PDB file of C-alpha atoms and ligand atoms in Angstrom:
ATOM      1  CA  UNK A   5    -150.110 104.099 161.934  1.00  0.00           C
ATOM      2  CA  UNK A   6    -149.751 106.543 159.447  1.00  0.00           C
ATOM      3  CA  UNK A   7    -151.449 104.182 156.751  1.00  0.00           C
ATOM      4  CA  UNK A   8    -153.438 105.119 153.914  1.00  0.00           C
ATOM      5  CA  UNK A   9    -156.502 103.043 152.991  1.00  0.00           C
ATOM      6  CA  UNK A  10    -157.904 101.639 149.267  1.00  0.00           C
ATOM      7  CA  UNK A  11    -161.656 101.558 150.529  1.00  0.00           C
ATOM      8  CA  UNK A  12    -162.523  99.849 146.911  1.00  0.00           C
ATOM      9  CA  UNK A  13    -160.192  96.482 147.749  1.00  0.00           C
ATOM     10  CA  UNK A  14    -162.189  94.950 150.620  1.00  0.00           C
ATOM     11  CA  UNK A  15    -164.582  94.918 147.406  1.00  0.00           C
ATOM     12  CA  UNK A  16    -162.690  94.066 144.603  1.00  0.00           C
ATOM     13  CA  UNK A  17    -160.666  91.005 146.763  1.00  0.00           C
ATOM     14  CA  UNK A  18    -164.395  89.789 146.979  1.00  0.00           C
ATOM     15  CA  UNK A  19    -165.285  89.841 143.713  1.00  0.00           C
ATOM     16  CA  UNK A  20    -162.006  88.270 142.197  1.00  0.00           C
ATOM     17  CA  UNK A  21    -163.275  85.609 144.719  1.00  0.00           C
ATOM     18  CA  UNK A  22    -166.054  84.835 143.285  1.00  0.00           C
ATOM     19  CA  UNK A  23    -164.654  84.710 139.964  1.00  0.00           C
ATOM     20  CA  UNK A  24    -162.418  81.967 141.159  1.00  0.00           C
ATOM     21  CA  UNK A  25    -165.194  79.778 142.656  1.00  0.00           C
ATOM     22  CA  UNK A  26    -167.685  80.599 139.156  1.00  0.00           C
ATOM     23  CA  UNK A  27    -164.627  79.476 137.137  1.00  0.00           C
ATOM     24  CA  UNK A  28    -163.640  76.638 139.785  1.00  0.00           C
ATOM     25  CA  UNK A  29    -160.235  77.518 140.727  1.00  0.00           C
ATOM     26  CA  UNK A  30    -157.793  76.557 144.202  1.00  0.00           C
ATOM     27  CA  UNK A  31    -161.641  75.429 145.451  1.00  0.00           C
ATOM     28  CA  UNK A  32    -160.884  73.182 148.034  1.00  0.00           C
ATOM     29  CA  UNK A  33    -163.863  71.701 149.793  1.00  0.00           C
ATOM     30  CA  UNK A  34    -167.660  70.287 148.286  1.00  0.00           C
ATOM     31  CA  UNK A  35    -170.552  71.473 150.516  1.00  0.00           C
ATOM     32  CA  UNK A  36    -172.944  68.131 150.663  1.00  0.00           C
ATOM     33  CA  UNK A  37    -176.284  70.055 151.535  1.00  0.00           C
ATOM     34  CA  UNK A  38    -178.561  66.623 150.262  1.00  0.00           C
ATOM     35  CA  UNK A  39    -178.139  65.999 146.889  1.00  0.00           C
ATOM     36  CA  UNK A  40    -176.557  69.162 145.804  1.00  0.00           C
ATOM     37  CA  UNK A  41    -172.964  69.630 146.361  1.00  0.00           C
ATOM     38  CA  UNK A  42    -171.094  72.613 146.353  1.00  0.00           C
ATOM     39  CA  UNK A  43    -167.674  73.765 146.326  1.00  0.00           C
ATOM     40  CA  UNK A  44    -166.306  76.236 147.998  1.00  0.00           C
ATOM     41  CA  UNK A  45    -163.127  77.974 149.499  1.00  0.00           C
ATOM     42  CA  UNK A  46    -162.556  77.052 152.750  1.00  0.00           C
ATOM     43  CA  UNK A  47    -160.949  80.333 154.658  1.00  0.00           C
ATOM     44  CA  UNK A  48    -164.557  81.799 152.602  1.00  0.00           C
ATOM     45  CA  UNK A  49    -166.564  79.718 154.441  1.00  0.00           C
ATOM     46  CA  UNK A  50    -165.018  79.835 157.678  1.00  0.00           C
ATOM     47  CA  UNK A  51    -164.585  83.736 157.368  1.00  0.00           C
ATOM     48  CA  UNK A  52    -168.267  83.776 156.817  1.00  0.00           C
ATOM     49  CA  UNK A  53    -169.642  81.504 159.096  1.00  0.00           C
ATOM     50  CA  UNK A  54    -168.538  80.024 163.243  1.00  0.00           C
ATOM     51  CA  UNK A  55    -169.716  76.340 162.048  1.00  0.00           C
ATOM     52  CA  UNK A  56    -167.579  76.279 159.220  1.00  0.00           C
ATOM     53  CA  UNK A  57    -164.779  78.513 161.453  1.00  0.00           C
ATOM     54  CA  UNK A  58    -165.207  75.243 163.452  1.00  0.00           C
ATOM     55  CA  UNK A  59    -165.154  72.597 161.395  1.00  0.00           C
ATOM     56  CA  UNK A  60    -162.027  73.641 159.743  1.00  0.00           C
ATOM     57  CA  UNK A  61    -159.977  74.709 162.512  1.00  0.00           C
ATOM     58  CA  UNK A  62    -160.191  71.128 164.194  1.00  0.00           C
ATOM     59  CA  UNK A  63    -157.747  69.112 163.926  1.00  0.00           C
ATOM     60  CA  UNK A  64    -158.776  66.454 161.855  1.00  0.00           C
ATOM     61  CA  UNK A  65    -161.520  68.406 159.867  1.00  0.00           C
ATOM     62  CA  UNK A  66    -159.824  71.100 158.666  1.00  0.00           C
ATOM     63  CA  UNK A  67    -157.905  67.914 156.144  1.00  0.00           C
ATOM     64  CA  UNK A  68    -161.556  66.557 154.737  1.00  0.00           C
ATOM     65  CA  UNK A  69    -162.610  67.807 151.395  1.00  0.00           C
ATOM     66  CA  UNK A  70    -166.214  66.729 151.410  1.00  0.00           C
ATOM     67  CA  UNK A  71    -168.483  68.347 154.242  1.00  0.00           C
ATOM     68  CA  UNK A  72    -172.168  66.520 154.817  1.00  0.00           C
ATOM     69  CA  UNK A  73    -174.534  69.260 156.592  1.00  0.00           C
ATOM     70  CA  UNK A  74    -177.536  67.795 158.446  1.00  0.00           C
ATOM     71  CA  UNK A  75    -180.068  66.787 156.271  1.00  0.00           C
ATOM     72  CA  UNK A  76    -182.851  68.992 157.973  1.00  0.00           C
ATOM     73  CA  UNK A  77    -180.812  72.068 155.467  1.00  0.00           C
ATOM     74  CA  UNK A  78    -182.455  72.696 152.330  1.00  0.00           C
ATOM     75  CA  UNK A  79    -180.258  73.060 149.474  1.00  0.00           C
ATOM     76  CA  UNK A  80    -181.811  76.984 147.963  1.00  0.00           C
ATOM     77  CA  UNK A  81    -181.259  78.588 151.876  1.00  0.00           C
ATOM     78  CA  UNK A  82    -177.452  77.066 151.389  1.00  0.00           C
ATOM     79  CA  UNK A  83    -176.896  78.245 147.812  1.00  0.00           C
ATOM     80  CA  UNK A  84    -178.447  81.759 148.621  1.00  0.00           C
ATOM     81  CA  UNK A  85    -176.237  81.238 151.556  1.00  0.00           C
ATOM     82  CA  UNK A  86    -173.148  80.593 149.878  1.00  0.00           C
ATOM     83  CA  UNK A  87    -173.888  83.152 147.372  1.00  0.00           C
ATOM     84  CA  UNK A  88    -174.236  85.873 149.887  1.00  0.00           C
ATOM     85  CA  UNK A  89    -170.805  85.012 151.359  1.00  0.00           C
ATOM     86  CA  UNK A  90    -169.249  85.366 148.391  1.00  0.00           C
ATOM     87  CA  UNK A  91    -170.771  88.566 147.145  1.00  0.00           C
ATOM     88  CA  UNK A  92    -172.479  91.152 150.214  1.00  0.00           C
ATOM     89  CA  UNK A  93    -176.137  89.884 148.419  1.00  0.00           C
ATOM     90  CA  UNK A  94    -178.635  87.921 149.688  1.00  0.00           C
ATOM     91  CA  UNK A  95    -181.364  87.136 147.889  1.00  0.00           C
ATOM     92  CA  UNK A  96    -184.113  87.435 150.572  1.00  0.00           C
ATOM     93  CA  UNK A  97    -187.660  86.705 148.841  1.00  0.00           C
ATOM     94  CA  UNK A  98    -191.242  85.844 151.264  1.00  0.00           C
ATOM     95  CA  UNK A  99    -190.365  82.590 149.197  1.00  0.00           C
ATOM     96  CA  UNK A 100    -187.503  81.679 151.218  1.00  0.00           C
ATOM     97  CA  UNK A 101    -186.933  83.482 153.792  1.00  0.00           C
ATOM     98  CA  UNK A 102    -187.494  80.655 156.555  1.00  0.00           C
ATOM     99  CA  UNK A 103    -185.559  78.454 155.235  1.00  0.00           C
ATOM    100  CA  UNK A 104    -182.698  81.156 154.614  1.00  0.00           C
ATOM    101  CA  UNK A 105    -182.753  82.057 158.188  1.00  0.00           C
ATOM    102  CA  UNK A 106    -183.334  78.410 159.170  1.00  0.00           C
ATOM    103  CA  UNK A 107    -179.205  77.849 157.765  1.00  0.00           C
ATOM    104  CA  UNK A 108    -178.230  80.504 158.332  1.00  0.00           C
ATOM    105  CA  UNK A 109    -179.301  79.654 162.008  1.00  0.00           C
ATOM    106  CA  UNK A 110    -176.790  76.417 162.185  1.00  0.00           C
ATOM    107  CA  UNK A 111    -174.683  78.136 160.132  1.00  0.00           C
ATOM    108  CA  UNK A 112    -173.646  80.877 162.582  1.00  0.00           C
ATOM    109  CA  UNK A 113    -174.168  83.335 160.404  1.00  0.00           C
ATOM    110  CA  UNK A 114    -175.286  86.220 162.387  1.00  0.00           C
ATOM    111  CA  UNK A 115    -175.699  89.523 160.298  1.00  0.00           C
ATOM    112  CA  UNK A 116    -177.852  87.353 157.900  1.00  0.00           C
ATOM    113  CA  UNK A 117    -180.461  85.900 161.589  1.00  0.00           C
ATOM    114  CA  UNK A 118    -180.697  89.743 162.434  1.00  0.00           C
ATOM    115  CA  UNK A 119    -182.013  90.770 158.732  1.00  0.00           C
ATOM    116  CA  UNK A 120    -184.193  87.636 158.569  1.00  0.00           C
ATOM    117  CA  UNK A 121    -186.098  88.475 161.622  1.00  0.00           C
ATOM    118  CA  UNK A 122    -186.544  91.717 161.063  1.00  0.00           C
ATOM    119  CA  UNK A 123    -188.375  90.918 157.319  1.00  0.00           C
ATOM    120  CA  UNK A 124    -190.323  88.600 159.647  1.00  0.00           C
ATOM    121  CA  UNK A 125    -191.293  91.003 162.070  1.00  0.00           C
ATOM    122  CA  UNK A 126    -192.487  93.596 159.819  1.00  0.00           C
ATOM    123  CA  UNK A 127    -194.509  90.504 157.973  1.00  0.00           C
ATOM    124  CA  UNK A 128    -196.481  90.154 161.323  1.00  0.00           C
TER     125      UNK A 128
ATOM    126  CA  UNK B   2    -156.920 106.016 148.657  1.00  0.00           C
ATOM    127  CA  UNK B   3    -158.159 108.150 152.314  1.00  0.00           C
ATOM    128  CA  UNK B   4    -157.019 108.501 155.109  1.00  0.00           C
ATOM    129  CA  UNK B   5    -158.584 105.980 157.690  1.00  0.00           C
TER     130      UNK B   5
ATOM    131  CA  UNK C   5    -181.925  91.326 140.736  1.00  0.00           C
ATOM    132  CA  UNK C   6    -184.173  92.253 143.927  1.00  0.00           C
ATOM    133  CA  UNK C   7    -181.226  90.952 145.939  1.00  0.00           C
ATOM    134  CA  UNK C   8    -180.646  93.334 150.162  1.00  0.00           C
ATOM    135  CA  UNK C   9    -176.596  94.222 150.674  1.00  0.00           C
ATOM    136  CA  UNK C  10    -174.824  93.467 154.549  1.00  0.00           C
ATOM    137  CA  UNK C  11    -172.187  97.051 153.665  1.00  0.00           C
ATOM    138  CA  UNK C  12    -169.714  96.679 155.446  1.00  0.00           C
ATOM    139  CA  UNK C  13    -169.248  92.640 154.403  1.00  0.00           C
ATOM    140  CA  UNK C  14    -166.840  91.925 152.244  1.00  0.00           C
ATOM    141  CA  UNK C  15    -164.742  94.655 155.011  1.00  0.00           C
ATOM    142  CA  UNK C  16    -165.581  91.390 157.669  1.00  0.00           C
ATOM    143  CA  UNK C  17    -164.384  88.769 154.810  1.00  0.00           C
ATOM    144  CA  UNK C  18    -161.398  90.715 155.181  1.00  0.00           C
ATOM    145  CA  UNK C  19    -160.329  91.339 158.341  1.00  0.00           C
ATOM    146  CA  UNK C  20    -161.105  87.313 159.695  1.00  0.00           C
ATOM    147  CA  UNK C  21    -158.646  85.917 156.223  1.00  0.00           C
ATOM    148  CA  UNK C  22    -156.025  88.193 157.307  1.00  0.00           C
ATOM    149  CA  UNK C  23    -156.463  86.381 162.061  1.00  0.00           C
ATOM    150  CA  UNK C  24    -157.036  83.346 159.499  1.00  0.00           C
ATOM    151  CA  UNK C  25    -153.511  84.462 158.289  1.00  0.00           C
ATOM    152  CA  UNK C  26    -152.249  85.811 161.930  1.00  0.00           C
ATOM    153  CA  UNK C  27    -153.081  82.472 163.480  1.00  0.00           C
ATOM    154  CA  UNK C  28    -151.597  80.267 160.314  1.00  0.00           C
ATOM    155  CA  UNK C  29    -154.276  78.361 159.520  1.00  0.00           C
ATOM    156  CA  UNK C  30    -155.126  76.860 155.991  1.00  0.00           C
ATOM    157  CA  UNK C  31    -152.193  79.170 154.833  1.00  0.00           C
ATOM    158  CA  UNK C  32    -151.396  76.703 152.150  1.00  0.00           C
ATOM    159  CA  UNK C  33    -147.678  79.208 150.518  1.00  0.00           C
ATOM    160  CA  UNK C  34    -144.940  80.166 151.514  1.00  0.00           C
ATOM    161  CA  UNK C  35    -143.386  83.162 149.276  1.00  0.00           C
ATOM    162  CA  UNK C  36    -139.099  83.688 149.832  1.00  0.00           C
ATOM    163  CA  UNK C  37    -137.806  87.303 149.155  1.00  0.00           C
ATOM    164  CA  UNK C  38    -134.702  86.456 149.317  1.00  0.00           C
ATOM    165  CA  UNK C  39    -133.485  85.548 153.189  1.00  0.00           C
ATOM    166  CA  UNK C  40    -137.515  85.949 154.690  1.00  0.00           C
ATOM    167  CA  UNK C  41    -140.353  83.953 154.126  1.00  0.00           C
ATOM    168  CA  UNK C  42    -144.258  84.537 153.676  1.00  0.00           C
ATOM    169  CA  UNK C  43    -146.656  82.690 154.869  1.00  0.00           C
ATOM    170  CA  UNK C  44    -149.845  83.067 152.870  1.00  0.00           C
ATOM    171  CA  UNK C  45    -153.702  81.999 151.406  1.00  0.00           C
ATOM    172  CA  UNK C  46    -153.027  81.763 147.428  1.00  0.00           C
ATOM    173  CA  UNK C  47    -156.614  82.765 146.477  1.00  0.00           C
ATOM    174  CA  UNK C  48    -156.122  85.824 148.454  1.00  0.00           C
ATOM    175  CA  UNK C  49    -152.348  86.626 146.847  1.00  0.00           C
ATOM    176  CA  UNK C  50    -154.093  85.928 143.605  1.00  0.00           C
ATOM    177  CA  UNK C  51    -157.307  88.328 144.467  1.00  0.00           C
ATOM    178  CA  UNK C  52    -154.175  91.186 144.745  1.00  0.00           C
ATOM    179  CA  UNK C  53    -151.602  90.640 142.534  1.00  0.00           C
ATOM    180  CA  UNK C  54    -151.878  90.021 138.941  1.00  0.00           C
ATOM    181  CA  UNK C  55    -148.602  87.683 138.835  1.00  0.00           C
ATOM    182  CA  UNK C  56    -149.907  85.716 142.096  1.00  0.00           C
ATOM    183  CA  UNK C  57    -153.113  84.467 139.626  1.00  0.00           C
ATOM    184  CA  UNK C  58    -151.098  84.195 136.319  1.00  0.00           C
ATOM    185  CA  UNK C  59    -148.489  81.446 138.450  1.00  0.00           C
ATOM    186  CA  UNK C  60    -151.611  79.862 140.355  1.00  0.00           C
ATOM    187  CA  UNK C  61    -153.694  79.837 137.876  1.00  0.00           C
ATOM    188  CA  UNK C  62    -150.133  78.031 135.681  1.00  0.00           C
ATOM    189  CA  UNK C  63    -151.734  74.032 136.140  1.00  0.00           C
ATOM    190  CA  UNK C  64    -148.214  72.869 137.138  1.00  0.00           C
ATOM    191  CA  UNK C  65    -147.342  76.040 139.723  1.00  0.00           C
ATOM    192  CA  UNK C  66    -150.805  75.796 141.015  1.00  0.00           C
ATOM    193  CA  UNK C  67    -149.203  72.740 142.565  1.00  0.00           C
ATOM    194  CA  UNK C  68    -145.953  75.236 144.614  1.00  0.00           C
ATOM    195  CA  UNK C  69    -145.633  74.682 148.864  1.00  0.00           C
ATOM    196  CA  UNK C  70    -142.857  77.308 148.311  1.00  0.00           C
ATOM    197  CA  UNK C  71    -142.807  80.925 145.318  1.00  0.00           C
ATOM    198  CA  UNK C  72    -139.644  81.924 144.804  1.00  0.00           C
ATOM    199  CA  UNK C  73    -139.746  85.778 143.748  1.00  0.00           C
ATOM    200  CA  UNK C  74    -137.152  87.375 141.422  1.00  0.00           C
ATOM    201  CA  UNK C  75    -133.795  88.416 143.735  1.00  0.00           C
ATOM    202  CA  UNK C  76    -134.057  91.707 142.652  1.00  0.00           C
ATOM    203  CA  UNK C  77    -137.654  92.383 145.651  1.00  0.00           C
ATOM    204  CA  UNK C  78    -137.467  93.874 148.504  1.00  0.00           C
ATOM    205  CA  UNK C  79    -138.784  91.683 151.538  1.00  0.00           C
ATOM    206  CA  UNK C  80    -140.147  95.519 153.219  1.00  0.00           C
ATOM    207  CA  UNK C  81    -141.937  96.674 150.123  1.00  0.00           C
ATOM    208  CA  UNK C  82    -142.615  92.865 150.172  1.00  0.00           C
ATOM    209  CA  UNK C  83    -144.472  92.755 153.630  1.00  0.00           C
ATOM    210  CA  UNK C  84    -146.145  96.573 153.397  1.00  0.00           C
ATOM    211  CA  UNK C  85    -147.539  94.780 150.341  1.00  0.00           C
ATOM    212  CA  UNK C  86    -148.518  91.933 151.529  1.00  0.00           C
ATOM    213  CA  UNK C  87    -149.853  94.010 154.542  1.00  0.00           C
ATOM    214  CA  UNK C  88    -152.295  95.638 152.098  1.00  0.00           C
ATOM    215  CA  UNK C  89    -153.518  93.081 150.635  1.00  0.00           C
ATOM    216  CA  UNK C  90    -155.634  91.509 153.570  1.00  0.00           C
ATOM    217  CA  UNK C  91    -155.521  95.009 154.788  1.00  0.00           C
ATOM    218  CA  UNK C  92    -155.887  97.907 152.573  1.00  0.00           C
ATOM    219  CA  UNK C  93    -154.109  99.833 154.376  1.00  0.00           C
ATOM    220  CA  UNK C  94    -150.353 100.885 152.992  1.00  0.00           C
ATOM    221  CA  UNK C  95    -147.975 102.000 154.790  1.00  0.00           C
ATOM    222  CA  UNK C  96    -146.154 104.720 151.739  1.00  0.00           C
ATOM    223  CA  UNK C  97    -143.284 106.347 153.730  1.00  0.00           C
ATOM    224  CA  UNK C  98    -140.639 109.017 151.934  1.00  0.00           C
ATOM    225  CA  UNK C  99    -138.423 106.039 153.072  1.00  0.00           C
ATOM    226  CA  UNK C 100    -140.040 102.914 150.743  1.00  0.00           C
ATOM    227  CA  UNK C 101    -141.669 104.146 149.032  1.00  0.00           C
ATOM    228  CA  UNK C 102    -139.237 103.308 146.253  1.00  0.00           C
ATOM    229  CA  UNK C 103    -139.024  99.490 146.824  1.00  0.00           C
ATOM    230  CA  UNK C 104    -143.230  99.548 146.852  1.00  0.00           C
ATOM    231  CA  UNK C 105    -143.248 100.905 143.523  1.00  0.00           C
ATOM    232  CA  UNK C 106    -140.889  98.835 142.148  1.00  0.00           C
ATOM    233  CA  UNK C 107    -142.014  95.563 144.354  1.00  0.00           C
ATOM    234  CA  UNK C 108    -146.120  96.491 142.718  1.00  0.00           C
ATOM    235  CA  UNK C 109    -145.511  96.838 139.843  1.00  0.00           C
ATOM    236  CA  UNK C 110    -143.470  93.190 139.265  1.00  0.00           C
ATOM    237  CA  UNK C 111    -146.349  91.897 141.502  1.00  0.00           C
ATOM    238  CA  UNK C 112    -148.568  93.998 139.441  1.00  0.00           C
ATOM    239  CA  UNK C 113    -150.857  95.045 141.835  1.00  0.00           C
ATOM    240  CA  UNK C 114    -152.361  98.377 139.815  1.00  0.00           C
ATOM    241  CA  UNK C 115    -154.068 100.695 142.349  1.00  0.00           C
ATOM    242  CA  UNK C 116    -150.568 100.758 144.031  1.00  0.00           C
ATOM    243  CA  UNK C 117    -148.902 101.650 141.734  1.00  0.00           C
ATOM    244  CA  UNK C 118    -150.917 104.195 140.626  1.00  0.00           C
ATOM    245  CA  UNK C 119    -151.054 106.608 144.295  1.00  0.00           C
ATOM    246  CA  UNK C 120    -147.013 105.495 144.560  1.00  0.00           C
ATOM    247  CA  UNK C 121    -146.684 107.816 141.095  1.00  0.00           C
ATOM    248  CA  UNK C 122    -148.989 110.247 142.608  1.00  0.00           C
ATOM    249  CA  UNK C 123    -146.638 110.479 145.537  1.00  0.00           C
ATOM    250  CA  UNK C 124    -144.005 110.421 143.817  1.00  0.00           C
ATOM    251  CA  UNK C 125    -144.826 113.341 141.915  1.00  0.00           C
ATOM    252  CA  UNK C 126    -146.183 115.984 144.235  1.00  0.00           C
ATOM    253  CA  UNK C 127    -142.823 115.228 145.767  1.00  0.00           C
ATOM    254  CA  UNK C 128    -141.115 116.444 142.387  1.00  0.00           C
TER     255      UNK C 128
ATOM    256  CA  UNK D   2    -178.272  96.170 154.925  1.00  0.00           C
ATOM    257  CA  UNK D   3    -179.091  98.562 151.651  1.00  0.00           C
ATOM    258  CA  UNK D   4    -180.599  98.726 148.429  1.00  0.00           C
ATOM    259  CA  UNK D   5    -177.908  98.305 145.996  1.00  0.00           C
TER     260      UNK D   5
HETATM  261  O1  LIG E   1    -171.551  84.844 162.758  1.00  0.00           O
HETATM  262  C1  LIG E   1    -170.597  84.732 162.896  1.00  0.00           C
HETATM  263  C2  LIG E   1    -169.550  85.377 161.401  1.00  0.00           C
HETATM  264  C3  LIG E   1    -168.635  84.314 161.869  1.00  0.00           C
HETATM  265  C4  LIG E   1    -167.033  84.355 160.905  1.00  0.00           C
HETATM  266  C5  LIG E   1    -166.196  83.640 162.090  1.00  0.00           C
HETATM  267  N1  LIG E   1    -164.602  83.852 161.477  1.00  0.00           N
HETATM  268  C6  LIG E   1    -163.765  83.725 161.644  1.00  0.00           C
HETATM  269  N2  LIG E   1    -164.234  84.551 163.030  1.00  0.00           N
HETATM  270  C7  LIG E   1    -162.660  85.040 163.477  1.00  0.00           C
HETATM  271 CL1  LIG E   1    -162.719  85.516 164.869  1.00  0.00          CL
HETATM  272  N3  LIG E   1    -160.864  85.038 162.844  1.00  0.00           N
HETATM  273  C8  LIG E   1    -161.729  84.205 161.831  1.00  0.00           C
HETATM  274  C9  LIG E   1    -162.345  83.820 161.284  1.00  0.00           C
HETATM  275  F1  LIG E   1    -162.619  83.375 159.656  1.00  0.00           F
HETATM  276  C10 LIG E   1    -166.081  83.214 163.361  1.00  0.00           C
HETATM  277  C11 LIG E   1    -167.686  83.416 163.824  1.00  0.00           C
HETATM  278  C12 LIG E   1    -168.321  83.684 163.109  1.00  0.00           C
HETATM  279  N4  LIG E   1    -170.101  84.131 163.132  1.00  0.00           N
HETATM  280  O1  LIG E   2    -153.285  94.921 139.233  1.00  0.00           O
HETATM  281  C1  LIG E   2    -154.545  93.841 139.287  1.00  0.00           C
HETATM  282  C2  LIG E   2    -154.546  92.913 140.486  1.00  0.00           C
HETATM  283  C3  LIG E   2    -155.254  92.176 140.321  1.00  0.00           C
HETATM  284  C4  LIG E   2    -156.052  90.660 140.836  1.00  0.00           C
HETATM  285  C5  LIG E   2    -156.032  90.520 139.836  1.00  0.00           C
HETATM  286  N1  LIG E   2    -157.045  89.087 139.855  1.00  0.00           N
HETATM  287  C6  LIG E   2    -157.840  87.916 139.272  1.00  0.00           C
HETATM  288  N2  LIG E   2    -158.004  88.868 138.557  1.00  0.00           N
HETATM  289  C7  LIG E   2    -159.667  87.621 137.895  1.00  0.00           C
HETATM  290 CL1  LIG E   2    -160.353  88.348 136.596  1.00  0.00          CL
HETATM  291  N3  LIG E   2    -159.938  87.235 138.520  1.00  0.00           N
HETATM  292  C8  LIG E   2    -159.314  86.839 139.611  1.00  0.00           C
HETATM  293  C9  LIG E   2    -158.303  86.733 140.036  1.00  0.00           C
HETATM  294  F1  LIG E   2    -157.722  86.277 141.445  1.00  0.00           F
HETATM  295  C10 LIG E   2    -155.866  89.972 138.012  1.00  0.00           C
HETATM  296  C11 LIG E   2    -155.036  91.099 137.865  1.00  0.00           C
HETATM  297  C12 LIG E   2    -155.104  92.093 138.548  1.00  0.00           C
HETATM  298  N4  LIG E   2    -154.072  93.029 137.537  1.00  0.00           N
HETATM  299 CL1  LIG E   3    -173.797  87.492 158.495  1.00  0.00          CL
HETATM  300 CL1  LIG E   4    -153.685  97.610 143.622  1.00  0.00          CL
END
């Protein structure tokens, strides 16, 4: 087409979606990771994770307001990945990289799994 | 704004 | 912080949100612009438009599944802006620029109003 | 991935 494009639009949209999350505006699901609860927007979770895309395209699961993750999932790992979904920034540290990588494999977030593998390889 |  | 950032994340999120819109997945509102209807995600509309941000943060209006816009709004202008919200690309043409600018002023999309003003000034 |  003959369209023009606003370079910062996608980043500005994501920043506003994170502001809605902060302010608990139009959040429509609670993700439970053992004793912790995380509120989020189903559409953002689906846009970032192959697991959530599969869950919320299922005719029965799309209607649930609570999703319980596997008990082996670490809440801190999930929190770091949820922050990444809404900001593009990943808080990867020596002390959390194994939990983050395991959580990203479970959530099916291939680009995160890729950077974790590279950071682990560099330490070996 | 740019030409994409 | 000491975060790393994935450059293409925000663009990839927006592309996936547009794929959900295409496939009518988890759309939760219909915007009516005279005889036409447009399905969308309330969160994307709020992230892009000051008018939708005000509508869906209102305690009564946040619960509506149908929103009727002012009858003076042009459906083609709205369609072009809705496509911009989900893609960052604006289909601005000599034949639609006045309707697009008027619609962006109504929807409170300041960056779009800015590029329309500049393109109009260049033609004068 | 970059250093933001
Ligand atoms: O690593 C990843 C990230 C990821 C996100 C999605 N999300 C969607 N995919 C499509 Cl094709 N349309 C809409 C979506 F919301 C699916 C698979 C995967 N795998
Ligand atoms: O030209 C524009 C575009 C636009 C979008 C928004 N959106 C939100 N603003 C904030 Cl501060 N937090 C969350 C949001 F969804 C508000 C005003 C305006 N004016
Ligand atoms: Cl990813
Ligand atoms: Cl704008």
